[PDB]
Amino acid sequence: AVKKFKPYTPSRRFMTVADFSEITKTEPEKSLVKPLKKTGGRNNQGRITVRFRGGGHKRLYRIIDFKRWDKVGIPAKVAAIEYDPNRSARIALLHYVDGEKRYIIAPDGLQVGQQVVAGPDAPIQVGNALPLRFIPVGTVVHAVELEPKKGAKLARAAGTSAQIQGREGDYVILRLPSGELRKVHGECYATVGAVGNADHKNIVLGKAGRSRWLGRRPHVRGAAMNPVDHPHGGGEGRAPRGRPPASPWGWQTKGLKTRKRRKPSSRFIIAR
Amino acid sequence: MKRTWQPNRRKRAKTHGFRARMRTPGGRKVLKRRRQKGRWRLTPA
RNA sequence: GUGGGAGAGGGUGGUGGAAUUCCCGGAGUAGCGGUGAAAUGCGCAGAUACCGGGAGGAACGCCGAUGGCGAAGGCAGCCACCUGGUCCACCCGUGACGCUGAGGCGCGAAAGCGUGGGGAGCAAACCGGAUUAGAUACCCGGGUAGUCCACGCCCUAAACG
RNA sequence: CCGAGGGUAGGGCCCGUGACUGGGGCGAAGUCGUAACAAGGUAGCUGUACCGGAAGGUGCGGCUGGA
RNA sequence: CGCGGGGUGGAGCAGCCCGGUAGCUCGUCGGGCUCAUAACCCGAAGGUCGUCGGUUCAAAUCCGGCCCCCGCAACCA
RNA sequence: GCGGGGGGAACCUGGGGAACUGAAACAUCUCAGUACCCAGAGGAGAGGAAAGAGAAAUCGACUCCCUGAGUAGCGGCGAGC
RNA sequence: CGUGGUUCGUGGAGCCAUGGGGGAAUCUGGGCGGACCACCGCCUAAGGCUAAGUACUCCGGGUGACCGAUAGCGCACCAGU
RNA sequence: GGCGAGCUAGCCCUGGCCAGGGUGAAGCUGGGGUGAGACCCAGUGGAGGCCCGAACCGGUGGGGGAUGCAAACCCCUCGGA
RNA sequence: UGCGAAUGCCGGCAUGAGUAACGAUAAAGAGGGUGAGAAUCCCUCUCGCCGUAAGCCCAAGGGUUCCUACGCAAUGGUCGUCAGCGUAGGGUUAGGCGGGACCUAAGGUGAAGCCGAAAGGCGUAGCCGAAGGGCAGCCGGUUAAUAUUCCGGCCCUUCCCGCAGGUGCGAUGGGGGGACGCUCUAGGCUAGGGGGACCGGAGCCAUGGACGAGCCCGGCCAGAAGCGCAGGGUGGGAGGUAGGCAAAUCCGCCUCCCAACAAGCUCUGCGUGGUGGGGAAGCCCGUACGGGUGACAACCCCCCGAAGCCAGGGAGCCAAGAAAAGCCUCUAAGCACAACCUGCGGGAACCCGUACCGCAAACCGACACAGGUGGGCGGGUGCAAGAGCACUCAGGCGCGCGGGAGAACCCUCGCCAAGGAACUCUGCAAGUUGGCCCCGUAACUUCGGGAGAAGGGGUGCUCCCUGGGGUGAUGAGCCCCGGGGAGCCGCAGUGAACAGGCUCUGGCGACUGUUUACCAAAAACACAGCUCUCUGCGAACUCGUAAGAGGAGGUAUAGGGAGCGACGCUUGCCCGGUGCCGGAAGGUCAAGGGGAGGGGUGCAAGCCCCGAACCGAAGCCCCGGUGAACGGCGGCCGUAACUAUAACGGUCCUAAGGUAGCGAAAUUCCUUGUCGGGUAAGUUCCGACCUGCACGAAAAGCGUAACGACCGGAGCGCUGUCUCGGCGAGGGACCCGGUGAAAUUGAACUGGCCGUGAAGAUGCGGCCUACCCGUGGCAGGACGAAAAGACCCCGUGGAGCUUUACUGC
RNA sequence: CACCUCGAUGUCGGCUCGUCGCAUCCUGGGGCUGAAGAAGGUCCCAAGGGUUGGGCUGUUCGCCCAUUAAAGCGGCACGCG
Ligand SMILES: [Mg+2]
Ligand SMILES: [Mg+2]
Ligand SMILES: [Mg+2]
Ligand SMILES: [Mg+2]
Ligand SMILES: [Mg+2]
Ligand SMILES: [Mg+2]
Ligand SMILES: [Mg+2]
Ligand SMILES: [Mg+2]
Ligand SMILES: [Mg+2]
Ligand SMILES: [Mg+2]
Ligand SMILES: [Mg+2]
Ligand SMILES: [Mg+2]
Ligand SMILES: [Mg+2]
Ligand SMILES: [Mg+2]
Ligand SMILES: [Mg+2]
Ligand SMILES: [Mg+2]
Ligand SMILES: [Mg+2]
Ligand SMILES: [Mg+2]
Ligand SMILES: [Mg+2]
Ligand SMILES: [Mg+2]
Ligand SMILES: [Mg+2]
Ligand SMILES: [Mg+2]
Ligand SMILES: [Mg+2]
Ligand SMILES: [Mg+2]
Ligand SMILES: [Mg+2]
Ligand SMILES: [Mg+2]
Ligand SMILES: [Mg+2]
Ligand SMILES: [Mg+2]
Ligand SMILES: [Mg+2]
Ligand SMILES: [Mg+2]
Ligand SMILES: [Mg+2]
Ligand SMILES: [Mg+2]
Ligand SMILES: [Mg+2]
Ligand SMILES: [Mg+2]
Ligand SMILES: [Mg+2]
Ligand SMILES: [Mg+2]
Ligand SMILES: [Mg+2]
Ligand SMILES: [Mg+2]
Ligand SMILES: [Mg+2]
Ligand SMILES: [Mg+2]
Ligand SMILES: [Mg+2]
Ligand SMILES: [Mg+2]
Ligand SMILES: [Mg+2]
Ligand SMILES: [Mg+2]
Ligand SMILES: [Mg+2]
Ligand SMILES: [Mg+2]
Ligand SMILES: [Mg+2]
Ligand SMILES: [Mg+2]
Ligand SMILES: [Mg+2]
Ligand SMILES: [Mg+2]
Ligand SMILES: [Mg+2]
Ligand SMILES: [Mg+2]
Ligand SMILES: [Mg+2]
Ligand SMILES: [Mg+2]
Ligand SMILES: [Mg+2]
Ligand SMILES: [Mg+2]
Ligand SMILES: [Mg+2]
Ligand SMILES: [Mg+2]
Ligand SMILES: [Mg+2]
Ligand SMILES: [Mg+2]
Ligand SMILES: [Mg+2]
Ligand SMILES: [Mg+2]
Ligand SMILES: [Mg+2]
Ligand SMILES: [Mg+2]
Ligand SMILES: [Mg+2]
Ligand SMILES: [Mg+2]
Ligand SMILES: [Mg+2]
Ligand SMILES: [Mg+2]
Ligand SMILES: [Mg+2]
Ligand SMILES: [Mg+2]
Ligand SMILES: [Mg+2]
Ligand SMILES: [Mg+2]
Ligand SMILES: [Mg+2]
Ligand SMILES: [Mg+2]
Ligand SMILES: [Mg+2]
Ligand SMILES: [Mg+2]
Ligand SMILES: [Mg+2]
Ligand SMILES: [Mg+2]
Ligand SMILES: [Mg+2]
Ligand SMILES: [Mg+2]
Ligand SMILES: [Mg+2]
Ligand SMILES: [Mg+2]
Ligand SMILES: [Mg+2]
Ligand SMILES: [Mg+2]
Ligand SMILES: [Mg+2]
Ligand SMILES: [Mg+2]
Ligand SMILES: [Mg+2]
Ligand SMILES: [Mg+2]
Ligand SMILES: [Mg+2]
Ligand SMILES: [Mg+2]
Ligand SMILES: [Mg+2]
Ligand SMILES: [Mg+2]
Ligand SMILES: [Mg+2]
Ligand SMILES: [Mg+2]
Ligand SMILES: [Mg+2]
Ligand SMILES: [Mg+2]
Ligand SMILES: [Mg+2]
Ligand SMILES: [Mg+2]
Ligand SMILES: [Mg+2]
Ligand SMILES: [Mg+2]
Ligand SMILES: [Mg+2]
Ligand SMILES: [Mg+2]
Ligand SMILES: [Mg+2]
Ligand SMILES: [Mg+2]
Ligand SMILES: [Mg+2]
Ligand SMILES: [Mg+2]
Ligand SMILES: [Mg+2]
Ligand SMILES: [Mg+2]
Ligand SMILES: [Mg+2]
Ligand SMILES: [Mg+2]
Ligand SMILES: [Mg+2]
Ligand SMILES: [Mg+2]
Ligand SMILES: [Mg+2]
Ligand SMILES: [Mg+2]
Ligand SMILES: [Mg+2]
Ligand SMILES: [Mg+2]
Ligand SMILES: [Mg+2]
Ligand SMILES: [Mg+2]
Ligand SMILES: [Mg+2]
Ligand SMILES: [Mg+2]
Ligand SMILES: [Mg+2]
Ligand SMILES: [Mg+2]
Ligand SMILES: [Mg+2]
Ligand SMILES: [Mg+2]
Ligand SMILES: [Mg+2]
Ligand SMILES: [Mg+2]
Ligand SMILES: [Mg+2]
Ligand SMILES: [Mg+2]
Ligand SMILES: [Mg+2]
Ligand SMILES: [Mg+2]
Ligand SMILES: [Mg+2]
Ligand SMILES: [Mg+2]
Ligand SMILES: [Mg+2]
Ligand SMILES: [Mg+2]
Ligand SMILES: [Mg+2]
Ligand SMILES: [Mg+2]
Ligand SMILES: [Mg+2]
Ligand SMILES: [Mg+2]
Ligand SMILES: [Mg+2]
Ligand SMILES: [Mg+2]
Ligand SMILES: [Mg+2]
Ligand SMILES: [Mg+2]
Ligand SMILES: [Mg+2]
Ligand SMILES: [Mg+2]
Ligand SMILES: [Mg+2]
Ligand SMILES: [Mg+2]
Ligand SMILES: [Mg+2]
Ligand SMILES: [Mg+2]
Ligand SMILES: [Mg+2]
Ligand SMILES: [Mg+2]
Ligand SMILES: [Mg+2]
Ligand SMILES: [Mg+2]
Ligand SMILES: [Mg+2]
Ligand SMILES: [Mg+2]
Ligand SMILES: [Mg+2]
Ligand SMILES: [Mg+2]
Ligand SMILES: [Mg+2]
Ligand SMILES: [Mg+2]
Ligand SMILES: [Mg+2]
Ligand SMILES: [Mg+2]
Ligand SMILES: [Mg+2]
Ligand SMILES: [Mg+2]
Ligand SMILES: [Mg+2]
Ligand SMILES: [Mg+2]
Ligand SMILES: [Mg+2]
């Protein structure tokens, strides 16, 4: 993985590019493609609600299958492994024997030419989606539903996975990529394997402009503002925080726990 | 050097135009005011 | 060559039990820990001791030896796959095809280093309690790198027979 | 044409010397402690690593040139 | 000059608020243990409280002055 | 089928509703239910025929003027209302 | 309970209104006379309409110890130009 | 209470532009090397917030201007390209 | 109801003043014309300027400025007979160009729906919305003024109707397609260009020579089908079928069978093509402008050659690169005497734009303003290349005051004896250097760099010989890249123009980048990268009362907040205080619950009111954790066998007493510390010492190659920076003619000194000096002008900002 | 000290241009000397003229280099924007 560069420019000395040898799709994408409305971090008022976004390459959205429980029993060949710009992971193209095509988010180890299937059936094998209740305790899995029929939510980022630690009633205990320990419903689908392209986290952006390609505009320290602008704005040189460290909106940014206390989901959580 | 006024006919009718004014309650009162004064033109040409 | 052996010899993947720690449940009360003796620490916010469940990492008790293997460093639960050396018998083949070896190349305990991961127990550094004239130690309570894995470095040693 | 050499520029090796600074050798009776030699009063040594006025201490592994 | 704190046995510090009898550690002295020193143990001595006035019955103590000390300040110019 | 819609100087009712200022500073208080914005009505609009007044065996819908009266009271018992 | 209206700024604070909670009765029922109780009175809430007396001045008219072209409306004049 | 992003700042959609030189990454190929490799050497290749420099975008230093040509300009010089 | 003041208001008219200025230093001269009047208008000649423009074409924007006749009050910076000006008349022609009776993008709007006191916000589909997609016209002639619009020639499109032939026809539904990046790029063309000894052509022989294979001018354009050349796109057949929200024979998917190729089929570019059309120099004609001839004009070879075309071409790369219609296919109801398809034929083909300016005198800049303004074309020669530089074509301009003079002084520019930074805050500025080819090239380094390091040599023209390419026949020609040899001239050969001065050594920042539009471009911001922290997804967080939305059609390898800021080596101790984190106990605690017990009133039943214990959240208290959380990290006294110093000790305090590294520093007050270095001499600078007023480890510590219009210090080179000035050029200044401002202004008949005076007198005193009035000059004074001091205070004036100020939200 | 000036009297240093004072740095003339000569010392007269070039610093000033007859001190809004 991880292409390096001789330093024939500054920032080429440190830059590091993804390895694309897993990818069979050359450029084009299957016309399960659809267009992406780039926000600029602006909401339906014209208002920036998320700072320092915008710019960056045009992208087509590849529509991807986060419920596998339509095609229950219908297998599919893995046609291609492709590049998807909207996610850390890679998408794998599936040709169903149905004749239908879907994109799956591509698991680690999954080969072009494999058969895949999803349902209460199905082997415990990489690619296969099952209700969680039927996945053997201990198997590591990705793309989990949190509640049944609602779509995969957990462990979709390149290299992530989750582990089945146990059963209790209609729920199973999972260990999320966060390390949190969560009861999830047994009925929820999941698909065995880790997500992979796990070398993803070692890319070294390497120069300013490469952050600009991903649509990340420069980020400015509160420390560098004036006090109109930020709790750290002010005061001659440099200067330390002068107060417990804050966000621009003034809440504390070291340690202050922000999850709502009375969330109903708390009955189903056990950890960090 | 580049000055403030850079006329473009679409922008103008899109902005101070008559239909523009009538959409917003704010703008209808501009018409109401301009009429009551006897402005020969309720709106830029 | 042929036929046979013994072996913690190496690499990869699996896998088992004991224990430690932490958590959950139970029962249960006034101390536990620790030492030369203590104190720090822990404990009525229910500790220790006891039982049930769970999680996680490391190391493999008896066998075990004054034993075996490897060139050396080293190598110890069990299973399979790949794989090195080695010895015995038969006396079949080649016909000196040998020894050694400056350079070269490769391997090389521990600690250390980089990038990830993993982190139970241990434990440099560090903190605290004792001791002492002092105690930057020895004993006690804590405790972070590290110890563990992958990849890549470092090349050292009472690397000793 | 070549040519002694002079000039101009840039390299290399060597010697001398330099505020200061690093250790080292030596020097009849200085100061601090006691690490080692006798379980040297914590067996000693050891590669390394961290720490500490100083000898050293501690960790990990090794040696017996110790019990 | 300004403001706040201080000055007490040989050293370093309490005591000063709140008037009446100066304490602590080290040091010093005499003894003990040791072959001896150090550690350790049993005894002891040592200060008029910077200085001069004042207040009171009584002043290290409360007040004033002078004297040294430590800290802070000296900006717009 | 019938209606609605939009406009109108000011005036009117209703929904909302400031500050400067005053208090010789300023928060309650004042400015003021003002300015203003919005809805609606009309030539007017509102209100109206007592579950009223309030000390007299009292008066009789509502509106408007005079008066009661700067009274009764209200009030960082201040400014002032 | 929370507020608004009233002269009433939490005051002894009723009355009228009502965002929230609980939540009746039909004359022997209910509301009110300034906390509350008695007595003695007043009135009949939770449906609706209702001229006139009132406000205004785009508009027409009549008057002025109103102006007379720097005044009087911003405009006496092809000015909201 | 309104009017403004025809200036300026950011973003969104959709187009356009960047003379000409220079340097020579990876890769590929070949050759060497090895037990196999790492690797080395060539040729090829044509990377880069890479170099020089117009257009274009700037605005570094100096001079001039200062009732200006100009309510920010002109000359020389200079940065990115 | 009386004005002299309010930097008053409105108007008028003065002063300054015939002063400054008349708007790029590209530049003018003369002859003729016209007219009342001519530097300024017209025409000729000559001269100068632009030429990747200062020429031409398009889009904005402007809106009659267009063409012409008559005209000069005003507008025009002068003049005006002219005009972008007055009056009047004329002038813009489209089925094919642009836009609309087509599509969708952001966004807007919005049946459904959702929210909101009202106003109104939101929102699926739909709809609107283009400089994107789709769509059929090319060449030439004509007008004073329009032309892909009129005309001429040659082509084409859609609707309607009919004929013929074909076929299950049929859609807003299903499917295909449309349909996509960046960089590099092949082959073949085309635009465009150069050359020709070949073809066509009026003429020309000057001034010494040339009647010549002389000079000069020109040698094309458009074109259906067909046909060539180059390219684009694309498999064909069968069987199965559960997917494409109905149904499909379509598409998808599995199987088999032939092609693997453009072979075919199709589509586009280019070439050729029936026909049509242009067609120079020169001479002549009166225009203000064009027209005749040249003429039956010629109309052809060679070469260069796109960034354009063939086009959806190819390759590589990561940052992964619109949509919908047109279009084709499939079927659906339906209809199959319909319908659709193909061909041909007749008809039918609407609205708006169309003048003119358009890098500017017509747009944005109050101006005929040296500013700003998107797209295309942009010729030739030379210089390595080029859109660069110089000169030039076509074409366009000499900038709407002029004439003279030849002072100071100013600006822009040229040169300079000897010296060479002595100048100065500083080499500021200006010099030097400068393009290409070759030789050559250090520390250090992250191995790329540093590097154009540095320092050098070459460079023109002539003749001779000779190598490789491209296109052509392997050939010549033409074109490209060279190699060797002998010579020639000058001061000089990148002969003009465009074109780095270099080195050593610190600080800061890693780097390219960003910024205070208009006094700061930096050491500030950003930046990859490191840490902490939050967030399990209807995520945290942000905007909104809400609905909604961003986050994100993302999911912990993700998202938010914060600090630090490549990289290297590192980042110590303190948890007492504050913050955050944990803690089911205990303490305190609001409403509420609870009512012991009390009260008002009533004859009483009762109504009414207080009300203790107790039970009651969060919060705080309390217990503990926490340092890339806010932050903090001692004092006095002694002590070594010279002295000094103090490894050592004592004692007070603390939550703990600053580790490594660094240190008179972007920090050091004393201070120009002391020593060393560089200098003849060094408050700066470099190195070092440590007595750090008052460094110190993610408001990071100490370093670091490379980078920098940053800031410091030193050398070489070279200089008008200077010793120290001089001369010269042009534009102003001066004079004459034309036009003619401004701030300012109590009035003026406005001298020096020494005094006096509200303390700095033209104005008062005393003396002295002094005929009236100007012009060019200098700036000492009128406490000169400008701006109701920006500092300072004052005001119970304001506003931005802060917090453990108060009070709220 | 707070008197003119806050409806503005621009502030250090440099440069340019000076002019004045004399408490004289030099040159001229003198007295005294603990003045042999030369060379000094000190004090008197004297303002005519003169009174250098560099290094360092923004500096005034000062220190230093090299010289000199000497390397004068003051004032003029710390002379002069
Ligand atoms: Mg909006
Ligand atoms: Mg971009
Ligand atoms: Mg930042
Ligand atoms: Mg700032
Ligand atoms: Mg703001
Ligand atoms: Mg703030
Ligand atoms: Mg701050
Ligand atoms: Mg500041
Ligand atoms: Mg600071
Ligand atoms: Mg700051
Ligand atoms: Mg978390
Ligand atoms: Mg304007
Ligand atoms: Mg437009
Ligand atoms: Mg616009
Ligand atoms: Mg009209
Ligand atoms: Mg074995
Ligand atoms: Mg044999
Ligand atoms: Mg090793
Ligand atoms: Mg190890
Ligand atoms: Mg652990
Ligand atoms: Mg300890
Ligand atoms: Mg101790
Ligand atoms: Mg332990
Ligand atoms: Mg070795
Ligand atoms: Mg020679
Ligand atoms: Mg020689
Ligand atoms: Mg030892
Ligand atoms: Mg010992
Ligand atoms: Mg010992
Ligand atoms: Mg020992
Ligand atoms: Mg040490
Ligand atoms: Mg230790
Ligand atoms: Mg060993
Ligand atoms: Mg003793
Ligand atoms: Mg006394
Ligand atoms: Mg201040
Ligand atoms: Mg109202
Ligand atoms: Mg107020
Ligand atoms: Mg007030
Ligand atoms: Mg007041
Ligand atoms: Mg006030
Ligand atoms: Mg009121
Ligand atoms: Mg009505
Ligand atoms: Mg009525
Ligand atoms: Mg009514
Ligand atoms: Mg009131
Ligand atoms: Mg009150
Ligand atoms: Mg009552
Ligand atoms: Mg009632
Ligand atoms: Mg009543
Ligand atoms: Mg009543
Ligand atoms: Mg009733
Ligand atoms: Mg009515
Ligand atoms: Mg009237
Ligand atoms: Mg008049
Ligand atoms: Mg008037
Ligand atoms: Mg009159
Ligand atoms: Mg008027
Ligand atoms: Mg904009
Ligand atoms: Mg261009
Ligand atoms: Mg390149
Ligand atoms: Mg570049
Ligand atoms: Mg450049
Ligand atoms: Mg400039
Ligand atoms: Mg005059
Ligand atoms: Mg004059
Ligand atoms: Mg003059
Ligand atoms: Mg003049
Ligand atoms: Mg002119
Ligand atoms: Mg001129
Ligand atoms: Mg040209
Ligand atoms: Mg137009
Ligand atoms: Mg105009
Ligand atoms: Mg006109
Ligand atoms: Mg005209
Ligand atoms: Mg005229
Ligand atoms: Mg005129
Ligand atoms: Mg006209
Ligand atoms: Mg036509
Ligand atoms: Mg449309
Ligand atoms: Mg809307
Ligand atoms: Mg369009
Ligand atoms: Mg178009
Ligand atoms: Mg068209
Ligand atoms: Mg034409
Ligand atoms: Mg059918
Ligand atoms: Mg052609
Ligand atoms: Mg002749
Ligand atoms: Mg030709
Ligand atoms: Mg002709
Ligand atoms: Mg392609
Ligand atoms: Mg449509
Ligand atoms: Mg036209
Ligand atoms: Mg242009
Ligand atoms: Mg023009
Ligand atoms: Mg002009
Ligand atoms: Mg212009
Ligand atoms: Mg103009
Ligand atoms: Mg621009
Ligand atoms: Mg431009
Ligand atoms: Mg060139
Ligand atoms: Mg040019
Ligand atoms: Mg000279
Ligand atoms: Mg020289
Ligand atoms: Mg310079
Ligand atoms: Mg060097
Ligand atoms: Mg060179
Ligand atoms: Mg020549
Ligand atoms: Mg050929
Ligand atoms: Mg040059
Ligand atoms: Mg250059
Ligand atoms: Mg420095
Ligand atoms: Mg920088
Ligand atoms: Mg750094
Ligand atoms: Mg650069
Ligand atoms: Mg910006
Ligand atoms: Mg900045
Ligand atoms: Mg600026
Ligand atoms: Mg500004
Ligand atoms: Mg810069
Ligand atoms: Mg600037
Ligand atoms: Mg870092
Ligand atoms: Mg909210
Ligand atoms: Mg959302
Ligand atoms: Mg989304
Ligand atoms: Mg920073
Ligand atoms: Mg730290
Ligand atoms: Mg420490
Ligand atoms: Mg703390
Ligand atoms: Mg704590
Ligand atoms: Mg704390
Ligand atoms: Mg409790
Ligand atoms: Mg209660
Ligand atoms: Mg509580
Ligand atoms: Mg605590
Ligand atoms: Mg410190
Ligand atoms: Mg220092
Ligand atoms: Mg120094
Ligand atoms: Mg400091
Ligand atoms: Mg200093
Ligand atoms: Mg010095
Ligand atoms: Mg230094
Ligand atoms: Mg820090
Ligand atoms: Mg540093
Ligand atoms: Mg810079
Ligand atoms: Mg830069
Ligand atoms: Mg000069
Ligand atoms: Mg001249
Ligand atoms: Mg006087
Ligand atoms: Mg007089
Ligand atoms: Mg008098
Ligand atoms: Mg003057
Ligand atoms: Mg004032
Ligand atoms: Mg105030
Ligand atoms: Mg005064
Ligand atoms: Mg003043
Ligand atoms: Mg003045
Ligand atoms: Mg004298
Ligand atoms: Mg003598
Ligand atoms: Mg004199
Ligand atoms: Mg200097
Ligand atoms: Mg000084
Ligand atoms: Mg003075
Ligand atoms: Mg002065
Ligand atoms: Mg000045």
Numbering used by the authors:
A (entry chain 11): 2 to 273
B (entry chain P8): 1 to 45
Quote what the paper states about this structure.
Here we present several high-resolution structures of Thermus thermophilus 70S ribosomes programmed by templates carrying missense errors. The collection of our structures puts forward a decoding mechanism that, for the first time, sets the molecular basis behind the phenomenon of translational infidelity and is in good agreement with in vivo studies of the missense errors that occur during protein synthesis.
Thus, the C·A mismatch at the first codon–anticodon position was shifted from the Watson–Crick geometry; however, the shift did not quite reach the wobble position, possibly reflecting a metastable or average state. The resulting interatomic distances and putative bond angles of the mismatch suggested that the formation of hydrogen bonds was highly unlikely. A close-up analysis at every mismatch revealed that despite the stabilization of the sugar-phosphate backbones by A-minor groove interactions with the A1492/1493 and G530 of the 16S rRNA, the nitrogen bases of the A·A and C·A mispairs did not interact stably. Independently of which near-cognate tRNA was present in the centre, the conserved A1493 and A1492/G530 of the 16S rRNA stabilized the first and second codon–anticodon pairs in a manner identical to that of the cognate models.
